[PDB]
A and B are shown apart, each in its own frame.
Chain A
């Protein structure tokens, strides 16, 4: 499993 904060950070990095 991947932490939801890490999913959100990936999307924010992408923008």
Chain B
């Protein structure tokens, strides 16, 4: 019932989650959240973390208990959505947007992908990216990553034309970060290793961009514009 006991439940839930004991992790995080809500209120800022942890554990559980070939799984997904969305709504009442909000939005996007809801995941990622563009440097790897996740959501959703500028942005971010590290060299070993890493990533992104431009030329994709 005390806050310290909720803290013990949270630490043990984290351990259970690392050890792939998803059921017990969800039980611990559920109990910690209930204690925190009873102390601070259902929609209080002090509960954000506990909602987030619980949502994350539920997502993990739903992913591990699904069989791709073919319910606890759908119920856990719906509850993960609920808990992460409450974390988001509470976060929305704070003046400054933080990386925790970015992360909550990315976790919500992943829930939506598991529910096969590409539109929601798209909105979640776009929101997260617009926050990230205020929080971190223009050539941040996290910004490149979110651009890429947007473009693959759009590709899987039959919108390759729209995916193209997001993939291009991810590629340009990788090359800009390359050139910036190159100028800084002008830890040196660490920067040069990262330059090579980014060059490989850029080539993978350039291949993805070629495939996207080809998909956007498919007759059904392009006829409306041609007409």
List residues of chain A with CB under 8 Å of any chain B CB. Answer: 1-2, 6, 9-10, 12-15
Contacts and interface: CB of A to CB of B under 8 A. Distances in A.
Question: Which secondary structure characterizes the binding site on chain B?
Answer: helix
Contacts of B170: 13
- Interface of A, secondary structure class, is helix
Contacts of A12: 197, 201, 204
A10 B113 contact: no
Contact of A9 (B113, B142, B148, B153): B148
Nearest to A3: B152
15 contacts: A2-B153, A2-B156, A6-B152, A6-B208, A9-B208, A10-B148, A10-B152, A12-B201, A12-B204, A13-B144, A13-B170, A13-B201, A14-B141, A14-B145, A15-B141
Interface string B94-138: 000000000000000000010000000000000000000000000
A13 to B, nearest CB: 4
Interface residues of B, number: 17
B149 interface: yes
